[PDB]
Each structure stands twice: as structure tokens, then as C-alpha cells.
Design a protein around this ligand. Structure first.
Ligand SMILES: Cc1c(N2C(=O)[C@@H]3[C@H](O)CCN3C2=O)ccc(C#N)c1Cl
Length: 248
């Protein structure tokens, strides 16, 4: 398949967080690094998204927005998958140097949101998600959140999102599936995508509050990341931009 050649051909590489595992595990130590990973992962997502099939049909002022609104979720999705394939959903494999043990889950103060992220990671296993299904879902994921008043050129956006929903269905369907089998895996796969949204929302809020009190707690925020968290994220939380759920 052509569409799959590119998806796999573009899948990023091992991005390291550049954490100092030697020094102890302070809350600040963790997040100042998580944030740094955010930053690093952000860049790759841009190069990934931009080199996506038909991605350039979007309006210039829509390409950037689509990516920034969707980066947490995307970072979450892939991260869940790394965890799965690597530590087998036992811990959260943020990066090779930033792997989360139960201790870290609690020291980051994100224990719970992490329970959630690890939960999603387990679905790849439980549901037996396929690398081909993962890649397709990840891509669609990007086209899963937009402003209520629509983008600059909504028509291109939706057209693009339609072609993606179909690539997903084209992959899930091509084996022992038929009727109840096809109209069951699609429900779950789309049910799995919807779940990343709630998690991203809670991560958004955490990060956002974290940026405001930033100094009070001595947590590091990169130029790039901080902007998004102050300009695009507020827009999500206030309601200006909302996710796109297949269900409910
Ligand atoms: C989710 C997340 C974050 N992440 C974020 O970007 C926000 C802020 O960094 C604060 C908490 N939170 C995170 O852990 C950073 C990097 C990666 C990767 N790889 C992921 Cl999956």
C-alpha cells in the first residue's frame, strides 16, 4: 500500500528526554525534563505532520494550529505505544532515558493522569492493536481537534480527515473480518481514539497550571512549549477549540 509506505517511512525516531537519571528524583527534576521532552517531541511532530500525505492541502494558518492543538494527544498516543511494545505496558516509556516507574508516577504529581496514560497503553495489548492500525490511528489523531468556528479552510480539513478515516477502515478490513467482525473492531479502534482526548485534556490543564506557577515550583519551560501552552492551550480549555469524537 502506498499510503502505508509513507506513514512508516515518516514515523519519527527515538527522541531522548536528556534526563539526568543519576541525580535524585525530585518533582521539578522530572517535569523540567518532561517539558524538555515536550519541546523535543514537538519538533519531530511538526516534521512528521508536514510530510504527511496531502497535509499541505490545508491552509497555511491551519497547518500550524492543527499540529499544536493535537500535539499532547499525539505525544500521548505514540508514548502509549512505545510503552506497550517496550516495557509491555508495565511502566511509561517516555524516552529511553525517561522511563516511569511507580515511584516517578507519584513524584511527578501526575500519578492518576499517568494511571490513565498507562491504561491507554494497555489497550494496544488488550485490543491487539496492529502497527499498521497504530500508524493509521496516530495520523487520523492529528485531524481530531478543531475550533468551533471552523478553520480558515474547513472544507480542505474535513476532506483530508475523511480520506484518513477511510485509510483506517481500509486497514482494519482485509482479513477474517466480515459484518459483525468489521463493525466491531471499528467501534473499538474509534473508541480507543476518543479516549486519548480526555487524557490530553487533563494533561493540558496540568501543564497549563504548571506554567503559571512555573517559578513558584522551579519547573523549566522551553520557549517553544510555553508559547503553545499560553496561546493555543488556553483556547482549548476555554472551549474555543474542541476535540472531534466519533462517539457520543
Ligand atoms: C505527555 C508527554 C509530555 N508531557 C507534556 O508535554 C506535559 C508537560 O510536559 C507537563 C506534563 N506533561 C507531560 O508529561 C512530554 C513529553 C512526552 C513524550 N515523549 C509526553 Cl507522552
Amino acid at each position: 500500500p502506498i499510503f502505508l509506505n509513507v506513514l512508516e517511512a515518516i514515523e519519527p525516531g527515538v527522541v531522548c528526554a536528556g534526563h539526568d537519571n543519576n541525580q535524585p528524583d525530585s518533582f521539578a527534576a522530572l517535569l523540567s525534563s518532561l517539558n524538555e521532552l515536550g519541546e523535543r517531541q514537538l519538533v519531530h511532530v511538526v516534521k512528521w505532520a508536514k510530510a504527511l500525505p496531502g497535509f499541505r492541502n490545508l491552509h497555511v494558518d491551519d497547518q500550524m494550529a492543527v499540529i499544536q492543538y493535537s500535539w499532547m494527544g499525539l505525544m500521548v498516543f505514540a508514548m502509549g505505544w512505545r510503552s506497550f511494545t517496550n516495557v509491555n505496558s508495565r511502566m511509561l516509556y517516555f524516552a529511553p532515558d525517561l522511563v516511569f516507574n511507580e515511584y516517578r508516577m507519584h513524584k511527578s504529581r501526575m500519578y492518576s493522569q499517568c494511571v490513565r496514560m498507562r491504561h491507554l497503553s494497555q489497550e494496544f495489548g488488550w485490543l491487539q492493536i496492529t502497527p499498521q492500525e497504530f500508524l493509521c490511528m496516530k495520523a487520523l489523531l492529528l485531524f481530531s481537534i478543531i475550533p468551533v468556528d471552523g478553520l480558515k479552510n474547513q472544507k480542505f480539513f474535513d476532506e483530508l480527515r475523511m480520506n484518513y478515516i477511510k485509510e483506517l477502515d481500509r486497514i482494519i478490513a482485509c482479513k477474517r473480518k466480515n459484518p459483525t467482525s468489521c463493525s466491531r473492531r471499528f467501534y473499538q479502534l474509534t473508541k480507543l481514539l476518543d479516549s486519548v482526548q480526555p487524557i490530553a485534556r487533563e494533561l493540558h490543564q496540568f501543564t497549563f497550571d504548571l506554567l503559571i506557577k512555573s517559578h513558584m515550583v522551579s519547573v523549566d519551560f522551553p520557549e517553544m512549549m510555553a508559547e503553545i501552552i499560553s496561546v493555543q492551550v488556553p483556547k482549548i480549555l476555554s472551549g474555543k477549540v474542541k476535540p472531534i469524537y466519533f462517539h457520543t
